[PDB]
């Protein structure tokens, strides 16, 4: 234990050159893929706006081509999942987490086409789903492919290139290099045993896919919110409360997404025909809602800067939250392709501003700005549901760029993780892996 | 398979007792670091107060520069040698070992030794950081509360030891995320799985950061303002800068390592000759902290001045060379105080140097040296201590130029790769290996 450690410490941070070069090629492919994917979803959302223009007069006829456009795109999405790759439904992060525990397979030949063209459909229809799900999962498979194609040997090379792909996947989805890495070394890693995930190799992956993102998406940020005000010390306790509020709510949300998975499993009973048709019904509803009140539907990146600025009224906020909770469940819980990561930012922003507003009039002496509380609460639902705060805090920090709010952001984030734990909640990503693994020991 | 399902639902479950004790550690670490930082200033102040009272006679003032630092260095080295030899140098190697259980945490001894010891070496204006002191002190504080409250377990032992060390780095740099990331990048047993509760480390870092902000608000450690952005066709220049740091990273490691050895001969392990040699270096630092202040001191004062492009190319080369020397002499000679900080001040100076050459080489790129300064700042940390993710974030938290993230990473990584391929090793783990092998000899 002493003489072995001296041999170990001098042989620390030693990653084989072959792994590193292959980590670089992974990133590139992940980025381009995510870029192409993101370019697809926009193009499809575009034709969808192009149809509403063609039929702008007849009120109910426009509402039809809103529904049927999303319906047909959702149905095409759900089908590709059910018929060719059932593992690539929902997020895909739980599947990759399992793949790192070796307790799941990585059917790359299958998922890539299914998740890619599948996501394009569900996201393109304006459903309340993220890109991470698709890009993270696709990212992992891309990394698995190059392991297979170049038949590389070992646990290290297998776990590492699976991880770096997953990270370059999140990075390219959020232009957030650090968030991608931190996600892997906060969740993603076997939290029960020591793994040979080369952290330096994850880096090169994330870099390449970030560069690839920046080549095609330069000069325009995903979230622009400008430099908000600072946060005085005597204000911090209000973020602690906000955290506690997220903390009790965090697991309550997890139960709802979990339960809704089951409650929607009855509606179709595992039947492909009834599933796809139910899928188009939700999809259609989202494309319908993406017109009658666009804040309720869609990914949610549009209403983040609008809420932070304090442009919604208190009434309009409460409504948006309630309607988004519903829409977020119906889409993700119903196992459509696409992560729940992004809508969880959009949800926390809306709650953050709600809390900010009440604080502002309660405490005029504090000279508050709800926007600070919106940014604190943005990655808070990620910190109490997914239970990866350090990833949530940095993800926000990388997208909003208000470092001066670091303390409030941590205080809220931690305040969420603590109460989310003490009210018996579980990491929603790990809770789904456990659900699918236990369902496998039940049918077998 | 069946054990994993029991594992997954029992994930992120940290005992409430650990968490409450994590919070109490942070507070203590912060306060301590705060008081420590207020000490160093106070002592550097009297040192300026002496030069005032003897401002006329030129060689007479140069004497009270030397003898002021000498007496404070000698007081420092002594406290280490006489009472706790383990708390010399940085202290981070010691805490890393403590996490592998291959080192003891003599808190009853180190706290007073490192604290009052540091105050001396730092207070005399020696080229040493505060991290060393604060990180080590931080760990001991966390060990103290484990012992005082007699808490049971490996989790409780490893966790409170770690959160203290993180709260230690945080309070030393006003950098909460850097503290955490340091623990979960180095610090952790990189060869077995540990029960370090990540959530508990947070609470510690929070509390010591609040502690820092109560006593030091409205004034930043490094102010540099919003620098320009970095165009994609420019990124390759940061790759080169990284490779330059990559070849140099391990070469520096050798020198700190070798210099430890070559200075061990000067005193031969003898406390009397050690302390006297210690005051000679200390004295030289307090002497240099007037004839050319950029060569001596922690280095935080010359970072903004370099980034702004206020030095000439000549002045830079000089500052680098001089700081290389002064950095070794202080740290290698086992004085209390980390080498973390001077390695920031080293990288900034090299960063600007590279930036300036680039600027005139490529007028079409519309460069600003300051961007290469900030890329190169945490680059030496990434090639010598080999914790890039902590270096990148530490700079990012102190300079606040997020727009330069990609260059900062590309340089950082470019450093870590070439520092690996030229057979270099994590300077913090290389010293632990040194001390452990000297133990079985």
């Amino acid at each position, epitope marked *: 234990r002493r003489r072995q450690l001296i041999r170990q410490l001098l042989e620390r941070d030693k990653t084989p050159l072959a792994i590193l070069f292959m980590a670089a090629v992974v990133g590139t492919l992940v980025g381009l893929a995510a870029v192409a994917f993101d370019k697809g979803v926009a193009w499809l959302q575009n034709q969808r706006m192009g149809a509403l223009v063609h039929t702008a007069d007849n009120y109910p006829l426009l509402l039809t081509v809103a529904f049927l456009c999303s319906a047909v795109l959702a149905m095409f999405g759900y089908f590709l999942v059910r018929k060719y790759a059932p593992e690539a439904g929902g997020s895909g992060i739980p599947e990759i987490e399992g793949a790192l525990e070796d307790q799941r397979p990585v059917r790359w030949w299958r998922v890539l086409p299914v998740k890619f063209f599948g996501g394009l459909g569900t996201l393109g229809g304006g459903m309340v789903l993220g890109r991470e799900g698709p890009t993270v999962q696709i990212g992992g498979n891309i990394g698995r492919m190059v392991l297979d194609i170049f038949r590389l040997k070992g646990d290290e090379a297998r776990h590492t290139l699976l991880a770096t792909g997953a990270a370059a996947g999140l990075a390219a989805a959020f232009n957030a290099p650090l968030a991608g890495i931190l996600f892997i070394i906060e969740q993603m890693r076997p939290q029960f045993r020591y793994t040979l995930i080369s952290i330096k190799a994850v880096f090169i992956g994330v870099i390449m896919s970030t560069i690839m993102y920046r080549i095609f998406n330069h000069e325009v940020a995903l979230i622009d919110v400008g430099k908000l005000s600072d946060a005085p010390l005597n204000t911090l306790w209000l973020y602690l409360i906000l955290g506690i509020i997220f903390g009790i709510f965090g697991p309550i949300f997890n139960k709802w997404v979990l339960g809704m998975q089951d409650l929607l499993h009855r509606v179709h009973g595992g039947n492909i025909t009834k599933w796809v048709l139910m899928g188009g019904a939700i999809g259609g509803l989202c494309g319908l809602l993406g017109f009658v009140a666009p804040a309720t539907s869609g990914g949610g990146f549009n209403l983040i800067p609008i809420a932070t600025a304090g442009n919604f009224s208190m009434g309009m906020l409460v409504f948006i939250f309630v309607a988004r909770v519903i829409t977020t469940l119906l889409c993700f819980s119903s196992g459509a392709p696409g992560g729940i990561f992004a809508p969880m930012l959009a949800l926390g922003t809306v709650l953050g501003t709600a809390f900010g507003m009440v604080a502002v009039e309660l405490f005029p*002496q504090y000279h508050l700005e709800a926007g600070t509380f919106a940014i604190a609460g943005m990655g808070a639902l990620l910190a109490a549901s997914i239970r990866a705060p350090l990833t949530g805090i940095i993800l926000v920090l990388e997208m909003t760029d208000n470092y001066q709010l670091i303390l409030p952001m941590i205080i809220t984030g931690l305040g969420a993780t603590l109460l989310a734990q003490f009210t018996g909640g579980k990491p929603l990503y790990s809770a789904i892996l456990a659900r699918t693994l236990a369902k496998q020991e039940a049918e077998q | 398979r069946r054990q994993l399902i029991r594992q997954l639902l029992e994930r992120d479950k940290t005992p409430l007792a650990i968490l409450f004790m994590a919070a109490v550690v942070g507070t203590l670490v912060g306060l301590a670091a705060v008081a420590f930082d207020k000490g160093v200033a106070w002592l550097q102040n009297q040192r300026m107060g002496a030069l005032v009272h003897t401002a006329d006679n030129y060689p007479l003032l140069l004497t009270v520069a030397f003898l002021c630092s000498a007496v404070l260095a000698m007081f420092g080295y002594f406290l280490v040698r006489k009472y706790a030899p383990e708390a010399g140098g940085s202290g981070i190697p010691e805490i890393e070992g403590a996490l592998e259980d291959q080192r003891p945490v003599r808190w009853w001894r180190v706290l007073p030794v490192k604290f009052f010891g540091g105050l001396g070496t730092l207070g005399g204006g020696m080229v040493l950081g505060r991290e060393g002191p604060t990180v080590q002190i931080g760990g001991n504080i966390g060990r103290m509360v484990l012992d005082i409250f007699r808490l049971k377990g490996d989790e409780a032992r490893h966790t409170l030891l770690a959160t203290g060390a993180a709260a230690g780095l945080a309070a030393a740099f006003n950098a909460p995320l850097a503290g955490i990331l340091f623990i979960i990048e180095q610090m952790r047993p990189q060869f077995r799985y540990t029960l370090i509760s990540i959530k508990a480390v947070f609470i510690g870092v929070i509390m010591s950061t609040i502690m820092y902000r109560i006593f030091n608000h409205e004034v930043a450690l490094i102010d540099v303002g919003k620098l320009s952005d970095a165009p994609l066709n420019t990124l390759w220049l940061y790759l080169i800068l990284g490779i330059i740091f990559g070849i140099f990273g391990p070469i520096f490691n050798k020198w700190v390592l070798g210099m430890q050895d070559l200075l061990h001969r000067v005193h031969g392990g003898n406390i009397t000759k050690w302390v006297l040699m210690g005051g000679a270096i200390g004295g030289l630092c307090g002497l240099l902290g007037f004839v050319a202040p950029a060569t001596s001191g922690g280095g935080f004062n010359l970072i903004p001045i370099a980034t702004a492009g206020n030095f000439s190319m000549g002045m830079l080369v000089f500052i680098f060379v001089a700081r290389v020397i002064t950095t070794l002499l202080c740290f290698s000679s086992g004085a209390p105080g980390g080498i973390f900080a001077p390695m920031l001040a080293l990288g900034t100076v090299l960063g600007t140097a590279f930036g300036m050459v680039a600027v005139e080489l490529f007028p079409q790129y519309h460069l600003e040296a300051g961007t290469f300064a900030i890329a190169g700042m945490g680059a030496l940390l990434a090639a010598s201590i080999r914790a890039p993710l902590t270096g990148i974030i530490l700079v990012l938290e102190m300079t606040d130029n997020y727009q330069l993230i990609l260059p900062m990473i590309i340089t950082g990584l470019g450093a870590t790769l070439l520092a690996q391929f030229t057979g270099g090793k994590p300077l913090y783990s290389a010293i632990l290996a040194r001390t452990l092998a000297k133990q079985e000899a």
Partner: antibody
Amino acid sequence: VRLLESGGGLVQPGGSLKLSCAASGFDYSRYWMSWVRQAPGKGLKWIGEINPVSSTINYTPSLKDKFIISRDNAKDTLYLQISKVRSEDTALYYCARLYYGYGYWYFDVWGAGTTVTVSS
Amino acid sequence: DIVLTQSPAIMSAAPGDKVTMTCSASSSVSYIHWYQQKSGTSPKRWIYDTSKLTSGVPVRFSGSGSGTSYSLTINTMEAEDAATYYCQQWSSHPQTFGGGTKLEILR
């Protein structure tokens, strides 16, 4: 940093006027601005405050339209309209930059002031 | 709103003398601020958050207290200390000032 307010002078009872505080030597945004008036040989009274985005303007317990605070970041200037004036409004008016320490707010820097005289 | 009344309305003291005014609040207040207004000029920020000296104030000044009772003090007065000193709360909205204490050179 300089605060320099004009617009003072003689006004008729039941009149109204528009004082102006023009700022120089700092980013005029980021800062909260405030008016504080001092009745002759008397105490300091708070009139009101306004944030940079002008999305919150607070006045003292004082009836409806009396005071109308506005600012023009583009010109780096702060305004105060006093309406249906009486003799009580006769005072020295300073504008002020707002800041904090722990978060308990203070009136950071002041202009010289303008004297409004209200008499017929 | 919170009322602040200052103790010696007007007072005199010879140079180099312990000078001590009070600022008593109607309700409970935390972290108050002191302002030095000389004759015919801007008020200047003197002491903030119960006790912190402003960037340029000579160290002979000081202040402390809590809850409902706060005070400013001069260990060794000077000539350049004759002015009105105005305390000011903002622990509650709206913010309120004191009536001022006028310090005068005794001779």
